Amino acid sequence: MTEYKLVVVGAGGVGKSALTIQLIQNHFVDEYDPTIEDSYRKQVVIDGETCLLDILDTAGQEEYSAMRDQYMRTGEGFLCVFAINNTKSFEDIHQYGEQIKRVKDSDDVPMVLVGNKCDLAARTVESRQAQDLARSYGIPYIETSAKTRQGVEDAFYTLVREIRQH
Ligand SMILES: Nc1nc2c(ncn2[C@@H]2O[C@H](COP(=O)(O)OP(=O)(O)NP(=O)(O)O)[C@@H](O)[C@H]2O)c(=O)[nH]1
Ligand SMILES: [Ca+2]
Ligand SMILES: [Ca+2]
Ligand SMILES: [Mg+2]
Ligand SMILES: [Mg+2]
Hints:
By secondary structure, this protein is α/β, with parallel strands linked by helices. The chain has 5 helices and 6 strands; from the N terminus they run E-H-E-E-H-E-H-E-H-E-H. The protein has one domain (3-165): Rossmann fold (3-Layer(aba) Sandwich). Strands 2-3-1-4-5-6 form a 6-stranded mixed β-sheet, sandwiched between helices. The chain is globular, with a radius of gyration of 14 Å. GTP binds at residues 13-18, 29-35, 59-60, 116-119, 145-147. One of its GO terms (cellular component) is glutamatergic synapse.
């Protein structure tokens, strides 16, 4: 079957794992569980076609930047996650976007910019700000809550469609 190599990137704690676990295991559990590097392979049907989502869930820890080159090198499309209550994580996702472009020698990489934790009240990143960044990349912006599942399928399946339409 068609395989889609999806990589979930972003600063520590923005909800990269929570998003992936909601998609694959249909649940949210509030818990502290930092990622080193985890792989989820799930066969899905998207728009009538069977495909294998090969999802790499990465670490937000700054001490892993050398290891980021490797999975950016081999990754097909990227969920670029920040949290809407964490302005620093929004600044950081600019750096991820630039690194993806440098490692892959391309500004045509399928990506979706994801503003996660949209269930939370203390918003500090406005949607228009994130939309401006996504426009500069030519990519969609989608808000998500791993907690409520709002936008989760939207974000992952839109990334698949962005790859498929590449
Ligand atoms: N309210 C709310 N909390 C969330 C959401 N997504 C994740 N969290 C919470 O935020 C924390 C970090 O989530 P996690 O998925 O582990 O983040 P991560 O980006 O994978 N971290 P790491 O880079 O260390 O692997 C956890 O307490 C988790 O329960 C969300 O959409 N809403
Ligand atoms: Ca181009
Ligand atoms: Ca597009
Ligand atoms: Mg994680
Ligand atoms: Mg280069």
